[PDB]
Design a protein around this ligand. Structure first.
Ligand SMILES: *C(=N)N(C)N(C)C(=O)[C@H](CC(C)C)NC(=O)NCc1ccccc1
Length: 254
């Protein structure tokens, strides 16, 4: 099929409320789990024609997936998607909304940027326990609130393949390398210019575009709406900038 010059999942599937929802991972290294549950929420809705229209629980995945790494100390994408396929993930909103089976336990904070939330600072919460219990007001038992995928996979390090995957099946999770200058991002199309590595980060790629001839990916971060472009950023597309085309993972419900 023909790939359009720009694509935005928010515009293609606006009935799916997760797609335009920016989350905050708080003072926990759970980016891996956020990019996962965000894209899983999106795809559950997209691929079911809107029948599933839920916010999947970051804390269920973060706390209960044993094979996914080190919890609030960082994690691994492939096993996060395997967990969704095999065990599934329950529902759960942000702390402040406290909806669904297992809402997130940690409050919004600023991630190296200015705004209306307390600064995140440098300290990290301990990984929450795997409690397997919906909040008192939610009247579905934990195991019966699970949402499962059918398959999970890595996407080829090929720009066109990634575009086709997003436009047919919905937003994807992706890893990339964080350099110090990324923490100064306010707006625009990011590329690494200054600073040393801070390791990686995991995010949700929702589309692409071009401005002033410069191609980009359009990405949701998990650092709240004050960060970047109302929670989003753009990064150079087509040159594997910061490995953005090389660590893409997603999955399907059918
Ligand atoms: C996100 N909030 N965090 C802490 N990250 C960057 C991660 O979870 C990453 C995700 C990948 C880049 C996709 N994984 C890790 O940080 N894993 C733990 C780790 C890895 C190497 C050395 C120490 C710890």
């Amino acid at each position: 099929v023909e790939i359009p010059s720009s694509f935005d999942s928010r515009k293609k599937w606006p009935r799916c409320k997760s797609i335009a929802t920016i989350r905050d991972q708080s003072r926990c290294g759970s980016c891996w789990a956020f990019g996962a549950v965000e894209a899983m929420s999106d795809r559950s809705c997209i691929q079911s024609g809107g029948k599933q229209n839920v916010e999947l629980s970051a804390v269920d995945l973060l706390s209960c997936c044993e094979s996914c790494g080190l919890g609030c100390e960082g994690g691994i994408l492939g096993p996060a998607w395997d967990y969704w396929v095999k065990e599934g993930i329950v529902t759960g909103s942000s702390k402040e909304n406290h909806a669904g089976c297992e809402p997130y336990p940690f409050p919004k904070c600023e991630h190296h940027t200015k705004g209306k939330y307390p600064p995140c600072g440098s300290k990290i919460y301990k990984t929450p326990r795997c409690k397997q219990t919906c909040q008192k007001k939610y009247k579905t038992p934990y195991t019966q609130d699970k949402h499962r995928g059918k398959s999970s996979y890595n996407v080829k390090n090929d720009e066109k393949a990634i575009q086709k995957e997003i436009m047919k099946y919905g937003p994807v999770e992706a890893g990339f390398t964080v350099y110090e200058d990324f923490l100064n991002y306010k707006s625009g199309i990011y590329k690494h210019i200054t600073g040393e590595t801070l390791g990686g980060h995991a995010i949700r790629i929702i589309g692409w575009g071009v401005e002033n001839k410069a191609p980009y990916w359009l990405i949701a971060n998990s650092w709240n709406e004050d960060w970047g472009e109302n929670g989003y950023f753009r990064i150079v597309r087509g040159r594997d900038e910061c490995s953005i085309e090389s660590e893409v993972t997603a999955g399907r419900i059918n």
